[PDB]
Swiss-Prot record, chain C:
Organism this protein belongs to: Severe acute respiratory syndrome coronavirus
Result after altering residue 64 to M: In strain: Isolate BJ04
Whole-protein coverage range: 938 to 1120 of 1255
Annotated consequence of substituting residue 62 to G: In strain: Isolate Shanghai LY
Described purpose of this protein according to its UniProt entry: Acts as a viral fusion peptide which is unmasked following S2 cleavage occurring upon virus endocytosis.
Gene name of this polypeptide: S
Glycosylation sites: 119, 143, 179
Protein name: Spike protein S2'
Coiled coil region boundaries: 1-38
Length: 137, 411, 183, 49
């Protein structure tokens, strides 16, 4: 057997023609781009989302200038955080919870607080408890 | 024919409310990473501008359907400590905090009877096919949290939770007002409150053993997964169609053949795959219009059936519904049905009115049932001998305008 | 609108043909050669045209969902009073004022909202002279002073008389029977 | 400048190449026709739109 294929029909594994080492062939990383802005009347800063990618290769290829598209004036500011949606780059991770304003995915939303664009986990609502009092209404 | 002895059982109702949102990059679906395809692509026109406006327009609507069903709740009420409400055993329905699951015992068995494209689940891997399935907005823990705050809050507040502020009420005071809905008296609950509670405790025990043993009660949720699988694989196998070219490979046609032999067969496989891409985009757009229907049967059976009690026949429970239980499930909602099913009727003689003083005597409620011995007023949902008095019957007109009046006396 | 700008901007596409104006295809090419390059422009301009019909045809049925909503939510809510759960606003709907909107409607639902709550201690039954007594409509309300009856939307006292008391059954069976004096 | 365009790529107005007067262009007429009839039973005259 020379090479392998996946559950689809493109080859992802090969026995090496020179030294017979059994290899894997994953394709190169790719995906979509979002832009998270609070409004031109609000501000003039944005923070971009790069979809379905690993932050190891994305944060590398920015500094090494390997992205098509490439921007004229842009830098990360060293804010790279991995969601399951992808590497949110340009916003500030905050450890609190709020209500969702601009969605991202996997329970992460982003908005414009003190100003700068911040990212967090959603709060499902107000927290409360009700007593099960055996004789009370 | 009027009953006296009924049953309470549980019926499972299953709906899906969302399917898997996808997205497609053209330049790896269409072109397969070749350069000259993209040169040929920009001469068709920017048609992938519109073909990611559509699969974003669907993917933004699988967030709403998950959010319009579950996020009706204003306040996330905590799971109470004791889960035993006057003999009502809510243990299997609210989540057990001892497990590291944040899931009830029902929901764990639901995931284990249900149980090609790039995904980042953490291990993120890409496929050669440009098919990605982005994860949803609300993860299943948030879905299992709105479930738990709909059975914690309704066990302690009832219909008030859907009415307004979640006012406290004892749950035995709760179910009795839900007998008042179906025209059935308070004495039917309180007198019978032992075996009312102990059929319902074993009716949950039926659904356990019915779902530990078998499956296919979740056939609808399986088919939502199956229509995901086919429409991706049909989109997969049409990559390998020749479309009149000498092969379906854009890089063989690129490299192996002549440059005049190339552009003839590059331009074939793009126009083939482009309108095979549009057929996928259209058939997602139709299949996401049935979900938008069956997520509105769930956003009304979680408005009307879970918060209130429904006055609608064979709607969220055969027979007369009493309470509803939401559950989480993979891609959809599983309801449970506390239903009033009357049983064991006998034959009784009815008659329109009483002839006393030469005047007709008109009931406010029900019929007049002859015992074989005595006339009295009852309702047709359980046998209830209430005796004919001066205010549970009123008067207009003389006798024998009704055909078959009783020579009786209003006592 | 953006369905039409999809459609207008596809005039200027070449569709893989020689040009995007028919008076530049017919001009340069000679009529044996031009009419095959016109055919790839016609077919290119039809397949974006029929797709526009199907995108209009699916978005037409997206509105018959919302037009059979508004036919009900006017002819059940303005023309009656809705007795359903958060149909026609949030609360207890009283009236509804429909307005007219460009390509749609505007409703003005007026709801009844309860407010200003206060606890007390409750009871499901009264033991009065050997029997258990039950509420016709309401609950047994004890504000620390006396025992009375009120309704579940407004706190207003009702003297526990056998007019509004469901008189049936013996005492000391039901859970929670409280020794009172029914008048 | 010698001729104007609209929001599409059609030249909707030009200037006179000889006397420099700027002239609109208008698509002389087109449109559909519909037939407004009472039915061929009760009548045999129509009215076109
Ligand atoms: C994004 O890409 C980066 C790099 O491309 C990737 O980070 C890598 O993660 C793997 C694990 O997922 C790391 O591999 C481990 O390294 C440690 C220390 O070197 C080893 O001890 C580990 O061995 C354990 O695991 C093996 C396999 O599970 C077991 O067989 C073994 O017995 C041990 O239990 C393992 O080799 C790797 O070091 C990093 N590399 C870098 C550069 O960070 C990341 O996971 C990717 N993320 C996504 C979402 O794809
Ligand atoms: C009206 O309906 C109810 C329920 O549908 C009937 O109650 C059932 O009564 C039988 C007795 O004939 C119970 O069996 C006994 O149960 C006890 C449990 O403590 C057990 O110790 C005995 O050995 C015996 O098995 C049965 O459990 C009970 N049903 C339920 C669900 O508890 C009732 O009989 C019906 N009345 C008529 C007139 O049909
Ligand atoms: C309310 O319902 C719950 C079901 O969730 C009841 O819990 C069940 O209780 C029985 C009795 O203890 C358990 O059986 C025993 O379990 C232990 C645990 O390992 C085992 O060692 C014994 O051999 C026996 O099988 C049963 O497992 C348990 N169910 C679950 C899911 O934990 C509970 O008892 C009910 N409430 C009341 C008041 O009965
Ligand atoms: C109620 O009445 C029906 C008919 O009035 C009864 O049904 C009949 O039962 C007899 C036996 O007693 C049979 O011979 C007949 O053929 C039955 N007729 C029908 C139409 O079913 C029924 O048994 C009665 N039930 C009670 C509880 O009184
Ligand atoms: C509890 O409710 C009762 C009415 O059901 C209130 O009783 C009346 O209170 C007014 C004002 O104090 C007196 O003038 C009446 O004589 C009372 N009537 C009776 C029958 O007691 C009572 O005030 C309420 N409790 C509180 C703390 O306000
Ligand atoms: C409410 O009144 C009932 C009346 O039956 C009380 O029942 C009596 O209970 C006492 C002891 O608690 C017995 O000595 C009597 O014999 C019972 N009455 C009868 C008729 O047998 C009941 O206890 C009262 N409630 C409370 C809380 O004391
Ligand atoms: C920008 O936002 C402010 C917020 O109040 C508003 O008052 C202002 O009118 C907005 N600008 C314009 C041009 O409308
Ligand atoms: C509730 O009240 C009933 C009767 O008063 C009693 O049997 C039961 O133990 C009480 N439960 C709690 C949790 O207080
Ligand atoms: C009705 O009839 C049954 C048996 O025929 C008898 O036991 C019962 O007392 C009667 N009830 C009335 C109110 O006549
Ligand atoms: C009831 O009494 C009236 C008056 O005597 C009589 O006409 C009628 O026949 C009686 N009913 C029956 C069923 O005999
Ligand atoms: C009602 O009772 C609960 C607990 O019994 C208490 O926390 C709450 O403050 C009370 N509210 C009022 C208005 O009395
Ligand atoms: C051409 O000449 C005529 C007069 O002979 C003059 O009216 C007109 O403006 C001229 N046009 C141009 C384009 O020179
Ligand atoms: C035709 O017209 C006549 C009157 O003009 C009418 O009575 C008849 O019903 C019509 N029939 C049909 C099939 O239209």
């Amino acid at each position: 057997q020379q090479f392998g294929r996946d559950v689809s029909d493109f080859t992802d594994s090969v026995r090496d023609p020179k030294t017979s080492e059994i290899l894997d062939i994953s394709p190169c990383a790719f995906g979509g781009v979002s832009v998270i802005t609070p409004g031109t009347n609000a501000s003039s800063e944005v923070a971009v989302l790069y979809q379905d990618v690993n932050c190891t290769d994305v944060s590398t290829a920015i500094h090494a200038d390997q992205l098509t598209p490439a921007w004229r004036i842009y830098s990360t500011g060293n804010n790279v955080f991995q969601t399951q949606a992808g590497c949110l780059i340009g916003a500030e991770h905050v450890d609190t919870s709020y209500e969702c304003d601009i969605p991202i995915g996997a329970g992460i939303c982003a908005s414009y607080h003190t100003k700068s664009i911040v990212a967090y986990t959603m709060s499902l609502g107000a927290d409360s408890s009700i007593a099960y009092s055996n004789n009370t209404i | 024919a009027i009953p006296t002895n009924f049953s309470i059982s549980i019926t499972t109702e299953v709906m899906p409310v969302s399917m898997a949102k996808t997205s497609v990059d053209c330049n790896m679906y269409i072109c397969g990473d070749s350069t000259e395809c993209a040169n040929l692509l920009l001469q068709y026109g920017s048609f992938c501008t519109q073909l990611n406006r559509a699969l974003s327009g669907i993917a933004a609507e699988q967030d709403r359907n998950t959010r319009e069903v579950f996020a009706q709740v204003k306040q996330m009420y905590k799971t109470p400590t004791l889960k035993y409400f006057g003999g009502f055993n809510f243990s299997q329905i609210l989540p057990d905090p001892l497990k590291p699951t944040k899931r009830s015992f029902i929901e764990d068995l639901l995931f284990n009877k249900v149980t090609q494209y790039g995904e980042c689940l953490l291990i993120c891997a890409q496929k050669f096919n440009g098919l990605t399935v982005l994860p949803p907005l609300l993860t299943d823990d948030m879905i299992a949290a709105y479930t738990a705050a709909l059975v914690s809050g309704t066990a302690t507040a009832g219909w008030t939770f859907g009415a307004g502020a979640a006012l406290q009420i004892p749950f035995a005071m709760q179910m009795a007002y839900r007998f008042n809905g179906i025209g059935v008296t308070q004495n039917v609950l309180y007198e019978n409150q032992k075996q009312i509670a102990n059929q319902f405790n074993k009716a949950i025990s039926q659904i356990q053993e019915s779902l530990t043993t078998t499956s296919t009660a979740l056939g609808k949720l399986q088919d939502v997964v199956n229509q995901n699988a086919q429409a991706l694989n049909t989109l997969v196998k049409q990559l390998s169609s020749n479309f009149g070219a000498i092969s379906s490979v854009l890089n063989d046609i690129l490299s192996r053949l002549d440059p005049p032999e190339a552009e003839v067969q590059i331009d074939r496989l793009i126009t083939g795959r482009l309108q095979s891409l549009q057929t996928y985009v259209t058939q997602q757009l139709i299949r996401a219009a049935e979900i938008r229907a069956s997520a509105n049967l769930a956003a009304t059976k979680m408005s009307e059936c879970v918060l209130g009690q429904s006055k609608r026949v064979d709607f969220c429970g055969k027979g007369y519904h009493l309470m509803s239980f939401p559950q989480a499930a993979p891609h959809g909602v599983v309801f449970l049905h506390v239903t009033y099913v009357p049983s064991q009727e006998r034959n009784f003689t009815t008659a329109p009115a009483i002839c006393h003083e030469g005047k007709a005597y008109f009931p406010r409620e029900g019929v007049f049932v002859f015992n074989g011995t005595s006339w009295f007023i009852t309702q047709r949902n359980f046998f209830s001998p209430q005796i004919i008095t001066t205010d549970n019957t009123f008067v207009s007109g003389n006798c024998d305008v009704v055909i078959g009046i009783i020579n009786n006396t209003v006592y």
